[PDB]
Design a protein around this ligand. Structure first.
Ligand SMILES: [Mg+2]
Ligand SMILES: [Mg+2]
Ligand SMILES: [Mg+2]
Ligand SMILES: [Mg+2]
Ligand SMILES: [Mg+2]
Ligand SMILES: [Mg+2]
Ligand SMILES: [Mg+2]
Ligand SMILES: [Mg+2]
Ligand SMILES: [Mg+2]
Ligand SMILES: [Mg+2]
Ligand SMILES: [Mg+2]
Ligand SMILES: [Mg+2]
Ligand SMILES: [Mg+2]
Ligand SMILES: [Mg+2]
Ligand SMILES: [Mg+2]
Ligand SMILES: [O]
Ligand SMILES: [O]
Ligand SMILES: [O]
Length: 87
RNA sequence: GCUGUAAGUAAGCUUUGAUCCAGAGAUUUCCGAAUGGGGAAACCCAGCAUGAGUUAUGUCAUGUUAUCGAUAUGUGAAUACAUAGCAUAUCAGAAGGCACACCCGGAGAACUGAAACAUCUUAGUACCCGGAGGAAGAGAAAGAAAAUUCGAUUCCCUUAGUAGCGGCGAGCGAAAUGGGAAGAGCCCAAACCAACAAGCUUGCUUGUUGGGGUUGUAGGACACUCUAUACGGAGUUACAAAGGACGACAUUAGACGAAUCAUCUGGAAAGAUGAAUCAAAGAAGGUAAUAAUCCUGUAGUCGAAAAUGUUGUCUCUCUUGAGUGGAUCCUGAGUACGACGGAGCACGUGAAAUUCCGUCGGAAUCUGGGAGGACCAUCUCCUAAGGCUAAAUACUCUCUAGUGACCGAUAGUGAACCAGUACCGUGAGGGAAAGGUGAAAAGCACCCCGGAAGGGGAGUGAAAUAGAACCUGAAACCGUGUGCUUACAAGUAGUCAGAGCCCGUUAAUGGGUGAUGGCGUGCCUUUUGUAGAAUGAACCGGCGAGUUACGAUUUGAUGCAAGGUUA
RNA sequence: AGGGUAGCGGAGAAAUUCCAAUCGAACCUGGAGAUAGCUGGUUCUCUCCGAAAUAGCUUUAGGGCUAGCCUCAAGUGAUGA
RNA sequence: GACAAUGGUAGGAGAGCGUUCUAAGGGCGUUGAAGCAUGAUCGUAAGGACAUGUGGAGCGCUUAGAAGUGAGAAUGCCGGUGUGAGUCGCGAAAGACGGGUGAGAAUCCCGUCCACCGAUUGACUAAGGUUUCCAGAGGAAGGCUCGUCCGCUCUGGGUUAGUCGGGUCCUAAGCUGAGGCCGACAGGCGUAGGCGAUGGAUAACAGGUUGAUAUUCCUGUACCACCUAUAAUCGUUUUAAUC
RNA sequence: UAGAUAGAAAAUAGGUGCCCGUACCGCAAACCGACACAGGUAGUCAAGAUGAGAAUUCUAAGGUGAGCGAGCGAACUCUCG
RNA sequence: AGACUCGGUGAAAUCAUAGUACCUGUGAAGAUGCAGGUUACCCGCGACAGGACGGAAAGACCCCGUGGAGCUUUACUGUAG
């Protein structure tokens, strides 16, 4: 439900980090974001592409802090905890 | 975001709202009841009309073409009449399929039990056939019963394994009174009238509609008195007559949907440590390890353009309802009943009622007839010989939502995976084995030997002795090395004693080996008795055999007590 | 080569021979977990007690029933040896 | 503290251990669960703890309840592994040499010789099987050895008809069979007609050609039916030409 | 012949001509026989010398060398002289 | 030709554990496994075949079963016709 906005990945390899997302993959439920870099290899010794994680993620717009995203009233449109700006 | 499982590549689509979800609609090749003919199922061959293309034939497109019946036609003649037949047209008719379930009907067995068996039982079960339903059957008293009588049917309890049937053996087995679930009663036939009809006896009667009328405490007709009036009404489309309008509710896609931060460990926290929060939501599952406060979610609330289903009110239809009197008529005929053979009723021919079947005989008409377990009498009750009928009930191929002191890959569906498959058989038919990498594919770049395969290295990853025949990885079985020991030796193979050599524990009367001596004929089963040359086991792993309901009986406990107890 | 007859049956130059490698009555499914007085098998330890192989009847003698002989819990109460 | 008993099958009575699950309570667990393995330990027994290694996520304990509750033996079912055994066999048969290939050849290709069948181990078709056919690669298993090869795998590719066998022609045996006769239902019989060839009738030959097709392709030469176009014969639509 | 129907077409030119099957083995390695199995598997052609002859012996056409072999040359079994 | 040695490939019915003598005796009354004596260094390979009451086939003979089928008849009871 996300198309390249901000997040804070909290509960994975290394946390406290943020970044912006690529394909959400609705079926596998796995998003692509800067924060994991597999050492893939083809015939280079390594490749350093970008890999995915399950949704252990959260958004942050006004508080500059993770909150439970909360799609609220119809004006649909997002309406977060403390502040209500677009997703 | 998408182009299924099923990767991958390339081409492309998508806020001008894809894909996806739900409802309607359009298409829906061929076989198959198969239906134009034929046919080895999925092929072939035609016909007629119309219409494509040819100069023209060949060739094609669409439509149409079976049988049966049941209506309307014409036509029919072996015989003149006119029927049998014949050609044509109409029908949303039927045929078939199935859920091996539940129901009714036709037909209908044997092993077995009886300690054998023929009566009998199993059983009126199985399978077969047929029909219909979503439920069926039954059904509104020619009952039950014996009183302060009740007044369709069905099912559950109970009466009762009682009364009874029975080579009186096996065994079989009610019904009623009573307590409950559901509760519903109605139309014909007939005598009477009108109409039309052939015989018109110019007598009226039969033939067809409409009325008319539906019963035991007798009723209707017929005669008479009032109600109603084309309606005051009851209507009730689930019987009772068969048609149609218009609101509410549920279903088939969905949405909202409160709440948490940090330190340590970690590859990774959802854990420990602390301090905080929501609760109509601490159900559940997933999330790199065990989460109410990360996601999906739940409590609760909202929501349907269209379609369906059930319900409601006006339309809608359709309808007279009682009473008396009973002069005269009517109350279901080759029926009821009897005998003869049989079946079925719990009931085997028994004294055997009551009900059905076949042959044959053969009643009555309300001052009538049937029953009340042979049969007659009195008494009591009911009125066949015509028909319809919801619910209560039985089952679940299937769907929705749920659940389990149910299984967790030799269990459980046979089937967790590409299974009614491979396979076997001519064929009916029978029938397999086979789950798991990791959190994520990050699925081993690169070097080296090698023809390859395979491997050693290097790297991804916490771990690759997790590397695809990939979690864990036992035992059999096979090896490699090694401490001790073994080449004059008669061995169910061990045990007891014990020197020598070596080693040091879940640290105690230690452990490994064992020159030599004493002693000693496996295990179960079955047996008068077995080393047994009587049987079975090749080894090891798994699997695998006194269970459950109902009832009787006793034992122990427990509660009550001349009372106790519920279905 | 194409066809027929099908098991309470058929066909048989007849032997109880053939009927999809089987025939003193084929084959598959269902009744059906048929029946068996017969054989075989019956899973984890200890403690206490402890037999019989006889009588009778049995279309019975390798089975059964009753009495004997055992065990357990009550009762009797010195009756037993 | 004394006294006495304590072998034991069928079998009777009694007390007991552990597994799976449930309920409740209380606890353990990445600072490594379960299981597994090793061990010189506890208990009278069935059995249970402990330490260590491997293992990588759930488990114990007390009380009680319900059980698909225990397996050495069924000529038991299934699975795996041996024993026999590197033992019998390797499925009639005459091959040898050279040269190539290849990582590697008694077995593969090439040739020369030799031997064998020859009313045939030859050539052609039917039934039958279903792509085995041909080319190019490959050798994991199959081939009763080896294999650089195949009828095995992978990729690609191959079957041409107016005259041929057959259908649009016929029919027996037999099968089906409108109406119809019969039967408890099912269904059984059977006329009309219809299907059904191994038979009857039916218009074609020779050569060439591909790694793989041949009366099918081309090359030449022929035939039957049919339509269209064209004319030398007909003359009531009779009869005559004519169907 | 009943019947159709105005009234042909000699030989000429031109064209039109459907479905199935067709590969391969087919006394075999490919069919039935569970096997790349010493079995069966209808039919057609079937040459040469010798011979009555499709018999027999040896050869054409053409096809094959049989899917384990090398040693030694004992028992024993089998096949032949 | 097989067997036999070497190379290649590589099964099976069976199988309680085994380091598996003989005699005379005992014994379920015919012993590798017991008692008493006797002889025998450990391990092979090729041959024979007395024993392993050897294997294979839950004895085809005999008997039992209140087992079963087929068949006969002036056995019973019934029946189609
Ligand atoms: Mg219809
Ligand atoms: Mg009678
Ligand atoms: Mg009668
Ligand atoms: Mg398992
Ligand atoms: Mg035992
Ligand atoms: Mg004896
Ligand atoms: Mg004969
Ligand atoms: Mg049985
Ligand atoms: Mg007794
Ligand atoms: Mg075992
Ligand atoms: Mg050579
Ligand atoms: Mg063919
Ligand atoms: Mg052959
Ligand atoms: Mg000759
Ligand atoms: Mg050898
Ligand atoms: O059985
Ligand atoms: O059985
Ligand atoms: O049985």
């Amino acid at each position: 439900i996300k198309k390249g906005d901000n997040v804070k990945v909290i509960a994975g390899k290394d946390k406290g980090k943020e970044g912006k997302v690529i394909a959400t993959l609705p079926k596998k439920d796995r998003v692509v974001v800067e924060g994991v870099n597999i050492m893939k290899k083809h015939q280079g010794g390594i490749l350093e592409t970008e890999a995915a994680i399950h949704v252990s993620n959260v958004q942050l717009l006004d508080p500059k802090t993770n909150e439970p995203t909360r799609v609220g009233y119809k004006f649909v449109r997002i309406a977060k905890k403390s502040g209500e700006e677009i997703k």
